Design a protein around this ligand. Structure first.
Ligand SMILES: CSC[C@H]1O[C@@H](n2cnc3c(N)ncnc32)[C@H](O)[C@@H]1O
Ligand SMILES: CSC[C@H]1O[C@@H](n2cnc3c(N)ncnc32)[C@H](O)[C@@H]1O
Ligand SMILES: NCCCCN(CCCN)CCCN
Ligand SMILES: NCCCCN(CCCN)CCCN
Ligand SMILES: [Fe+3]
Lengths: 345, 345
């Protein structure tokens, strides 16, 4: 197997699906398979969308390069790099450790996370590990985006708002979520701990209310990944920021977003006056959600076994505004949970 | 002292200098000074250009907010966050570690580093610590940008090329540098260790030779940071990549580049076919160079004592091409080593 084989597998998939699948996506697919035969692990190692993975694995099987039988087994020596093991074990490759946060935030957060609302399918929910929440908050601590600042959290299954509020740092934390279970849990924690934390039921398919426009120094979001998802979560965040000097924290996956779409996201940020100052790939590790068998991709999977360990991960982005973001504050139209590269909804 | 003072301090500096100095840079300046009396540590904690910090420190002193003597001491309570301390100590916040590299590369690189050429001012040199180099290469290993790949290094006081060769992963490594000392050291190492590693004297102000155009899968550079430096090094590197699916690794400082120049750099990348997949800020720690008292900024400093520990740092950026970059291969006109934001030449 040689380099042109990778090119032809991609073009074939590009022809069937209309999606931006290139040869390096095929290389990555094969590279992961050098290290694992487990489907979920292959996904984690690959950094390719699950929507691309399925037809690539099938194209590869058609050519006799891959055996699909209770696992994904390579049949040939391949022209693809093996995954390297360079990640720092002490911080799981993050570079940041939440244990270091003040106000004993890390230990107090673990107590709350034990009673957290379970992830549900209606809102594309699936929460990150506690260490991932605490480290995302620690990035914001390190960049001076918590202390004395007004913090907005757009969707909060991860409980970032709680973690941010437990540090003692923020002036206040406001959390928006469509799910009353998350709002109520946050309001129970706020009252029990004495935290300057409020939470409100709001569906981000509808415009951001005027109280929250240009009213915050810092936002966090781990959003749905459409262009619709970027209108519903990130565009709203940008509009919520007062302006120059305000910062945003954004989750970004490979599983549901290609590099062509990472580039569309980055171009959206740069054209609306922001700049990226951190992009830590693989920063968030997700806890397995209960509804995996009900997602769109499940019937497509070549091997179907419930995962037993984490496999879904995302990058953490920090952006900062160089000027005020005057974006439209419009309704989302179209199905937020049906992006063409989505798979876990 | 309210936020409007922060804005006035920035507006004065901006008006005096013509440079993009904003309120958040003044907040960052002050935030750092909450945490240290030491000028070099204040630079490291600030994330502000030294060309900015000098006049901000002077503007603060003029308003009776900062005492400047054998240390920098704040004279009032200030609305500025204290920088957080959540970096993982194990990997110095990078998330990556060199020790696991293949070929026993870490251990072998350390021994060659002991005899490295010392940094000279003629070429704006200043090498990162050995672990910074190794971690930079390890990021490339984790992203599959070394194994069976053709690697170009554009400038190499850091000896990234030797470190990458020592893994035994690349197909080959080509190093270009204007300094014959760097070239000759690499040749000797290549010969002694039997590595597929070659080095050539080349001045990046001149066109990339045709034999290196669109010839590589991976490049590394830690470049001079003007518009011009970014054209001589990064624009060359992009031209050197074959195209879609190829990777670049770029060092980018706060010390000599503002957030506005970071945003100009990011837009350059995105409009030339690239996408950022990693941006780890503060990844590289730099060893203190000999000619510090002959650098441009030295007479500007409000206190003048040799640094006893590291203070200059830079981000590590990973870019990937979504398509071929067809940039011009023209001669770079102007003064490479005299960018408006430069301070360490
Ligand atoms: C997208 S999953 C991250 C979070 O955003 C929330 N979320 C998902 N969809 C919406 C929506 N349309 N409006 C508001 N919050 C949402 C979820 O309930 C979860 O806490
Ligand atoms: C910017 S310093 C990093 C490296 O680039 C090299 N360098 C600096 N200027 C040039 C140039 N004009 N052409 C090639 N290499 C350069 C230095 O010798 C060093 O090893
Ligand atoms: N469907 C469960 C996985 C959700 C991942 N995130 C969506 C990103 C892809 N569009 C939301 C996670 C919130 N913590
Ligand atoms: N003048 C000494 C400091 C120069 C910094 N540059 C050194 C590059 C080689 N390691 C890098 C600036 C970041 N692009
Ligand atoms: Fe670490």
């Amino acid at each position: 197997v040689n380099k042109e084989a990778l090119v032809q597998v991609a073009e074939e998939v590009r022809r069937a699906t209309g999606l931006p699948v290139g040869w390096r996506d095929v290389e990555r697919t094969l590279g992961a398979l050098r290290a694992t035969r487990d489907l979920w692990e292959a996904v984690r190692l690959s950094r390719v969308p699950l929507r691309f993975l399925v037809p690539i694995w099938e194209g590869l099987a058609r050519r006799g390069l891959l055996r699909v039988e209770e696992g994904l087994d390579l049949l040939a020596e391949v022209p693809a790099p093996r995954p390297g093991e360079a990640a720092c074990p002490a911080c799981e490759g993050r570079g940041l450790v939440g244990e270091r946060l003040p106000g004993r935030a890390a230990e107090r957060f673990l107590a709350w996370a034990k009673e957290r609302p379970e992830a549900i399918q209606d809102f594309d929910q699936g929460y990150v590990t506690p260490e991932s929440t605490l480290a995302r908050v620690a990035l914001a601590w390190n960049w001076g985006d918590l202390e004395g600042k007004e913090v907005l959290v757009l969707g909060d299954d991860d409980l970032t708002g709680l973690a941010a509020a437990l540090t003692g740092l923020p002036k206040r934390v406001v959390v928006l979520d469509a799910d009353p279970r998350i709002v109520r849990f946050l309001e129970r924690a706020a009252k029990a701990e004495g935290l300057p934390l409020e939470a409100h039921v709001h569906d981000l398919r509808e415009p951001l209310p005027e109280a929250w426009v240009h009213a915050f120094h810092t936002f966090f979001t781990d959003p749905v990944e459409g262009p619709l998802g970027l209108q519903a979560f990130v565009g709203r965040g940008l509009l919520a920021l007062e302006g120059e000097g305000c910062a945003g924290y954004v989750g970004l996956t490979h599983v549901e977003a290609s590099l062509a779409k990472w580039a569309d996201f980055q171009r959206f940020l740069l054209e609306n006056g922001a700049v990226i100052t951190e992009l830590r790939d693989g920063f968030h590790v997700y806890e397995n959600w209960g509804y995996i068998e009900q997602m769109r991709a499940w019937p497509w999977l070549p091997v179907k076994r419930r995962p037993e360990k984490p496999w879904y991960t995302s990058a953490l982005i920090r952006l900062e505004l160089l000027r005020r973001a005057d974006l439209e504050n419009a309704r989302v139209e179209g199905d937020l949970y049906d992006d063409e590269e989505s798979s876990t909804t």
